[PDB]
């Protein structure tokens, strides 16, 4: 997506560590963040709001 | 070097326009022709309270 | 206190409220839009200027500009004068 | 493309809640002071009686 491309362009090292916590979709990320499996979700402002 | 998805359909003349949650960035605007942004978006971090 | 309310852009009024303690905004933004680089219809600069603006948004240059020029707060915000009366008494 | 997203809003005066010397005399008016005296003195004397 666009968020991954922006992360790669800005902070490649952060992207390298973040690749191991990728999610299949938005709802899976939400249910993972509700539990302790995840701490922060990075995604576009409108959908997150 | 091949675009896939909504941008992929637009590039290869398979679709005149691509309405949807399409973020505007440098590479896409270089490859396709965007319109005026009608809603504010951007990277954001969403976490448990 | 010569004009009760001033209708103006969010950025300018937000900066003024940050700078001036006695002036405060209200929020609830309406008519959302974006500042643009106005210029003639038939100009070759258009595509390259738009690309440069988008690239500047892609990296933190616009964030750096916001930090340097806009995003700095002087005054945002019981007091002694509230209880001065009992000391007077 | 827009370089700063923002809308229209309203600026007003802060209207500081700055208080006066009588910040604790609001609940009762001046007359009640005489009245509260009339609620004590005439009692005390008759108690003495």
mmCIF file of C-alpha atoms in Angstrom:
data_model
loop_
_atom_site.group_PDB
_atom_site.id
_atom_site.type_symbol
_atom_site.label_atom_id
_atom_site.label_comp_id
_atom_site.label_asym_id
_atom_site.label_seq_id
_atom_site.Cartn_x
_atom_site.Cartn_y
_atom_site.Cartn_z
ATOM 1 C CA UNK A 1 0.000 0.000 0.000
ATOM 2 C CA UNK A 2 0.921 3.677 0.250
ATOM 3 C CA UNK A 3 1.766 3.529 3.962
ATOM 4 C CA UNK A 4 4.371 0.808 3.418
ATOM 5 C CA UNK A 5 5.931 2.758 0.542
ATOM 6 C CA UNK A 6 6.103 5.922 2.649
ATOM 7 C CA UNK A 7 7.665 4.012 5.552
ATOM 8 C CA UNK A 8 10.255 2.523 3.192
ATOM 9 C CA UNK A 9 11.074 5.940 1.733
ATOM 10 C CA UNK A 10 11.339 7.626 5.138
ATOM 11 C CA UNK A 11 12.754 5.095 7.637
ATOM 12 C CA UNK A 12 14.108 1.952 5.927
ATOM 13 C CA UNK A 13 15.447 0.551 9.208
ATOM 14 C CA UNK A 14 12.045 0.934 10.874
ATOM 15 C CA UNK A 15 10.470 -0.845 7.898
ATOM 16 C CA UNK A 16 12.980 -3.698 8.189
ATOM 17 C CA UNK A 17 11.909 -4.371 11.781
ATOM 18 C CA UNK A 18 8.226 -3.756 11.003
ATOM 19 C CA UNK A 19 8.031 -6.346 8.196
ATOM 20 C CA UNK A 20 7.757 -9.128 10.789
ATOM 21 C CA UNK A 21 4.495 -7.670 12.169
ATOM 22 C CA UNK A 22 2.526 -7.258 8.930
ATOM 23 C CA UNK A 23 -1.224 -7.887 8.924
ATOM 24 C CA UNK A 24 -3.460 -9.446 6.291
ATOM 25 C CA UNK A 25 -6.091 -6.721 6.551
ATOM 26 C CA UNK A 26 -7.582 -3.942 8.629
ATOM 27 C CA UNK A 27 -10.036 -6.022 10.690
ATOM 28 C CA UNK A 28 -7.370 -8.599 11.552
ATOM 29 C CA UNK A 29 -5.073 -5.779 12.657
ATOM 30 C CA UNK A 30 -7.876 -4.318 14.781
ATOM 31 C CA UNK A 31 -8.646 -7.616 16.513
ATOM 32 C CA UNK A 32 -4.916 -8.208 17.058
ATOM 33 C CA UNK A 33 -4.494 -4.736 18.590
ATOM 34 C CA UNK A 34 -7.481 -5.345 20.871
ATOM 35 C CA UNK A 35 -5.496 -8.272 22.279
ATOM 36 C CA UNK A 36 -1.855 -8.100 23.352
ATOM 37 C CA UNK A 37 -0.451 -9.435 20.078
ATOM 38 C CA UNK A 38 0.089 -5.878 18.785
ATOM 39 C CA UNK A 39 0.880 -2.474 20.275
ATOM 40 C CA UNK A 40 0.517 0.086 17.462
ATOM 41 C CA UNK A 41 -1.126 0.076 14.032
ATOM 42 C CA UNK A 42 0.177 2.388 11.298
ATOM 43 C CA UNK A 43 -2.336 3.108 8.549
ATOM 44 C CA UNK A 44 -4.067 5.962 6.767
ATOM 45 C CA UNK A 45 -5.861 8.616 8.794
ATOM 46 C CA UNK A 46 -9.387 8.346 7.370
ATOM 47 C CA UNK A 47 -9.922 4.603 7.836
ATOM 48 C CA UNK A 48 -8.330 4.646 11.292
ATOM 49 C CA UNK A 49 -10.538 7.556 12.367
ATOM 50 C CA UNK B 1 8.205 -2.470 -13.021
ATOM 51 C CA UNK B 2 4.546 -3.476 -13.446
ATOM 52 C CA UNK B 3 1.626 -1.812 -11.683
ATOM 53 C CA UNK B 4 -1.014 -4.114 -10.216
ATOM 54 C CA UNK B 5 -4.353 -3.228 -8.679
ATOM 55 C CA UNK B 6 -6.433 -0.119 -9.210
ATOM 56 C CA UNK B 7 -3.384 1.748 -10.503
ATOM 57 C CA UNK B 8 -2.632 -1.321 -12.601
ATOM 58 C CA UNK B 9 -6.080 -1.227 -14.189
ATOM 59 C CA UNK B 10 -5.833 2.512 -14.857
ATOM 60 C CA UNK B 11 -2.329 2.372 -16.363
ATOM 61 C CA UNK B 12 -3.060 -0.336 -18.938
ATOM 62 C CA UNK B 13 -6.230 1.478 -20.100
ATOM 63 C CA UNK B 14 -8.504 -1.184 -18.590
ATOM 64 C CA UNK B 15 -10.386 1.437 -16.539
ATOM 65 C CA UNK B 16 -10.822 5.150 -17.191
ATOM 66 C CA UNK B 17 -10.973 6.142 -13.515
ATOM 67 C CA UNK B 18 -10.392 4.384 -10.195
ATOM 68 C CA UNK B 19 -12.761 5.606 -7.488
ATOM 69 C CA UNK B 20 -11.973 4.345 -4.009
ATOM 70 C CA UNK B 21 -9.664 4.798 -1.036
ATOM 71 C CA UNK B 22 -6.670 5.635 -3.220
ATOM 72 C CA UNK B 23 -3.905 7.623 -1.541
ATOM 73 C CA UNK B 24 -2.001 10.234 -3.548
ATOM 74 C CA UNK B 25 1.800 10.108 -3.446
ATOM 75 C CA UNK B 26 4.700 10.915 -5.757
ATOM 76 C CA UNK B 27 5.031 7.661 -7.704
ATOM 77 C CA UNK B 28 1.324 7.205 -8.447
ATOM 78 C CA UNK B 29 0.892 10.840 -9.490
ATOM 79 C CA UNK B 30 3.912 10.395 -11.755
ATOM 80 C CA UNK B 31 2.437 7.236 -13.297
ATOM 81 C CA UNK B 32 -1.252 8.215 -13.412
ATOM 82 C CA UNK B 33 -3.179 11.510 -13.338
ATOM 83 C CA UNK B 34 -4.955 12.317 -10.078
ATOM 84 C CA UNK B 35 -7.867 14.635 -9.357
ATOM 85 C CA UNK B 36 -8.403 17.158 -6.555
ATOM 86 C CA UNK B 37 -8.307 15.404 -3.144
ATOM 87 C CA UNK B 38 -11.813 15.338 -1.685
ATOM 88 C CA UNK B 39 -10.946 13.986 1.789
ATOM 89 C CA UNK B 40 -7.979 14.441 4.119
ATOM 90 C CA UNK B 41 -5.870 11.340 4.773
ATOM 91 C CA UNK B 42 -2.339 10.474 5.831
ATOM 92 C CA UNK B 43 -0.213 8.184 7.982
ATOM 93 C CA UNK B 44 -1.471 7.761 11.534
ATOM 94 C CA UNK B 45 -0.839 5.474 14.501
ATOM 95 C CA UNK B 46 -3.769 3.870 16.328
ATOM 96 C CA UNK B 47 -3.192 2.151 19.680
ATOM 97 C CA UNK B 48 -5.179 0.724 22.569
ATOM 98 C CA UNK B 49 -6.268 3.243 25.188
ATOM 99 C CA UNK C 1 -13.132 43.706 21.959
ATOM 100 C CA UNK C 2 -14.140 45.707 18.886
ATOM 101 C CA UNK C 3 -15.173 42.625 16.884
ATOM 102 C CA UNK C 4 -16.827 39.722 18.678
ATOM 103 C CA UNK C 5 -15.853 36.992 16.204
ATOM 104 C CA UNK C 6 -13.491 36.675 13.238
ATOM 105 C CA UNK C 7 -14.046 34.071 10.515
ATOM 106 C CA UNK C 8 -10.775 32.987 8.925
ATOM 107 C CA UNK C 9 -8.524 30.106 7.926
ATOM 108 C CA UNK C 10 -7.744 27.416 10.482
ATOM 109 C CA UNK C 11 -3.961 27.758 10.209
ATOM 110 C CA UNK C 12 -3.810 31.539 10.648
ATOM 111 C CA UNK C 13 -6.262 31.648 13.550
ATOM 112 C CA UNK C 14 -4.613 28.659 15.230
ATOM 113 C CA UNK C 15 -1.220 30.360 15.030
ATOM 114 C CA UNK C 16 -2.663 33.624 16.354
ATOM 115 C CA UNK C 17 -4.393 31.854 19.251
ATOM 116 C CA UNK C 18 -1.122 30.106 20.081
ATOM 117 C CA UNK C 19 0.714 33.444 20.004
ATOM 118 C CA UNK C 20 -1.991 35.563 21.673
ATOM 119 C CA UNK C 21 -3.267 34.294 25.021
ATOM 120 C CA UNK C 22 -6.340 36.557 25.006
ATOM 121 C CA UNK C 23 -7.542 35.111 21.669
ATOM 122 C CA UNK C 24 -8.907 31.570 21.359
ATOM 123 C CA UNK C 25 -10.416 29.551 18.522
ATOM 124 C CA UNK C 26 -13.498 27.344 18.733
ATOM 125 C CA UNK C 27 -12.706 24.307 16.571
ATOM 126 C CA UNK C 28 -15.343 22.358 14.590
ATOM 127 C CA UNK C 29 -13.671 23.063 11.262
ATOM 128 C CA UNK C 30 -16.000 23.613 8.312
ATOM 129 C CA UNK C 31 -15.311 23.946 4.582
ATOM 130 C CA UNK C 32 -12.143 21.867 4.629
ATOM 131 C CA UNK C 33 -9.777 22.735 1.784
ATOM 132 C CA UNK C 34 -6.099 23.168 1.022
ATOM 133 C CA UNK C 35 -3.712 26.014 0.299
ATOM 134 C CA UNK C 36 -2.415 25.836 -3.255
ATOM 135 C CA UNK C 37 0.189 27.402 -5.517
ATOM 136 C CA UNK C 38 -1.971 29.448 -7.861
ATOM 137 C CA UNK C 39 -0.682 29.991 -11.387
ATOM 138 C CA UNK C 40 -1.800 30.193 -14.999
ATOM 139 C CA UNK C 41 -3.773 27.440 -16.710
ATOM 140 C CA UNK C 42 -1.362 26.898 -19.627
ATOM 141 C CA UNK C 43 1.920 26.621 -17.754
ATOM 142 C CA UNK C 44 4.496 23.835 -18.242
ATOM 143 C CA UNK C 45 5.533 24.149 -14.587
ATOM 144 C CA UNK C 46 2.345 22.461 -13.384
ATOM 145 C CA UNK C 47 3.265 18.773 -13.429
ATOM 146 C CA UNK C 48 6.749 19.279 -11.983
ATOM 147 C CA UNK C 49 5.484 21.659 -9.277
ATOM 148 C CA UNK C 50 2.791 19.177 -8.249
ATOM 149 C CA UNK C 51 5.367 16.377 -8.168
ATOM 150 C CA UNK C 52 7.685 18.491 -6.017
ATOM 151 C CA UNK C 53 4.873 19.330 -3.584
ATOM 152 C CA UNK C 54 3.901 15.666 -3.287
ATOM 153 C CA UNK C 55 7.533 14.648 -2.766
ATOM 154 C CA UNK C 56 7.905 17.313 -0.076
ATOM 155 C CA UNK C 57 4.858 15.829 1.638
ATOM 156 C CA UNK C 58 6.327 12.327 1.280
ATOM 157 C CA UNK C 59 9.394 13.112 3.385
ATOM 158 C CA UNK C 60 9.413 15.197 6.555
ATOM 159 C CA UNK C 61 10.224 18.527 4.897
ATOM 160 C CA UNK C 62 6.667 19.799 5.312
ATOM 161 C CA UNK C 63 6.672 18.525 8.899
ATOM 162 C CA UNK C 64 9.952 20.368 9.485
ATOM 163 C CA UNK C 65 8.434 23.560 8.073
ATOM 164 C CA UNK C 66 5.369 23.134 10.289
ATOM 165 C CA UNK C 67 7.615 22.673 13.329
ATOM 166 C CA UNK C 68 9.777 25.693 12.514
ATOM 167 C CA UNK C 69 7.173 28.236 11.416
ATOM 168 C CA UNK C 70 3.710 27.187 12.657
ATOM 169 C CA UNK C 71 3.905 24.493 15.351
ATOM 170 C CA UNK C 72 5.393 26.395 18.265
ATOM 171 C CA UNK C 73 3.219 27.434 21.205
ATOM 172 C CA UNK C 74 3.865 30.296 23.618
ATOM 173 C CA UNK C 75 0.704 30.199 25.754
ATOM 174 C CA UNK C 76 -1.929 27.477 25.398
ATOM 175 C CA UNK C 77 -3.321 26.688 28.879
ATOM 176 C CA UNK C 78 -7.118 28.089 41.379
ATOM 177 C CA UNK C 79 -5.121 31.310 40.991
ATOM 178 C CA UNK C 80 -3.928 33.659 43.720
ATOM 179 C CA UNK C 81 -6.253 36.474 42.636
ATOM 180 C CA UNK C 82 -9.201 34.090 43.025
ATOM 181 C CA UNK C 83 -8.438 33.754 46.754
ATOM 182 C CA UNK C 84 -7.168 37.318 47.223
ATOM 183 C CA UNK C 85 -10.555 38.242 48.690
ATOM 184 C CA UNK C 86 -10.260 36.025 51.763
ATOM 185 C CA UNK C 87 -6.787 37.431 52.465
ATOM 186 C CA UNK C 88 -8.281 40.917 52.157
ATOM 187 C CA UNK C 89 -11.006 39.886 54.616
ATOM 188 C CA UNK D 1 -1.797 19.778 -5.121
ATOM 189 C CA UNK D 2 -2.511 21.351 -1.711
ATOM 190 C CA UNK D 3 0.534 21.924 0.477
ATOM 191 C CA UNK D 4 -1.429 22.558 3.693
ATOM 192 C CA UNK D 5 -4.868 21.168 4.534
ATOM 193 C CA UNK D 6 -7.077 23.381 6.688
ATOM 194 C CA UNK D 7 -10.599 24.717 6.983
ATOM 195 C CA UNK D 8 -12.516 27.797 8.114
ATOM 196 C CA UNK D 9 -12.990 28.548 11.805
ATOM 197 C CA UNK D 10 -13.781 31.318 14.288
ATOM 198 C CA UNK D 11 -11.533 33.371 16.573
ATOM 199 C CA UNK D 12 -12.963 35.032 19.701
ATOM 200 C CA UNK D 13 -11.699 36.647 22.889
ATOM 201 C CA UNK D 14 -10.512 34.459 25.759
ATOM 202 C CA UNK D 15 -12.720 36.252 28.333
ATOM 203 C CA UNK D 16 -10.620 35.467 31.406
ATOM 204 C CA UNK D 17 -12.721 34.444 34.461
ATOM 205 C CA UNK D 18 -10.790 37.078 36.474
ATOM 206 C CA UNK D 19 -12.462 37.510 39.874
ATOM 207 C CA UNK D 20 -12.906 40.470 42.232
ATOM 208 C CA UNK D 21 -12.497 40.934 45.981
ATOM 209 C CA UNK D 22 -16.020 39.552 46.567
ATOM 210 C CA UNK D 23 -15.341 36.179 44.928
ATOM 211 C CA UNK D 24 -16.926 34.490 47.966
ATOM 212 C CA UNK D 25 -19.784 36.954 48.651
ATOM 213 C CA UNK D 26 -21.874 36.020 45.597
ATOM 214 C CA UNK D 27 -24.197 33.441 47.280
ATOM 215 C CA UNK D 28 -25.837 36.003 49.595
ATOM 216 C CA UNK D 29 -26.658 39.642 48.919
ATOM 217 C CA UNK D 30 -25.716 42.534 51.198
ATOM 218 C CA UNK D 31 -29.117 42.726 52.924
ATOM 219 C CA UNK D 32 -28.782 39.176 54.273
ATOM 220 C CA UNK D 33 -25.758 40.341 56.280
ATOM 221 C CA UNK D 34 -28.027 42.625 58.281
ATOM 222 C CA UNK D 35 -30.530 39.767 58.281
ATOM 223 C CA UNK D 36 -27.950 37.283 59.530
ATOM 224 C CA UNK D 37 -27.186 39.726 62.321
ATOM 225 C CA UNK D 38 -30.919 39.828 62.961
ATOM 226 C CA UNK D 39 -30.707 36.034 63.084
ATOM 227 C CA UNK D 40 -28.130 35.994 65.896
ATOM 228 C CA UNK D 41 -28.178 39.054 68.173
ATOM 229 C CA UNK D 42 -31.888 39.045 69.042
ATOM 230 C CA UNK D 43 -31.470 35.333 69.741
ATOM 231 C CA UNK D 44 -28.436 35.675 72.009
ATOM 232 C CA UNK D 45 -30.022 38.321 74.229
ATOM 233 C CA UNK D 46 -33.233 36.340 74.655
ATOM 234 C CA UNK D 47 -31.141 33.286 75.500
ATOM 235 C CA UNK D 48 -29.597 35.427 78.234
ATOM 236 C CA UNK D 49 -33.158 36.264 79.265
#
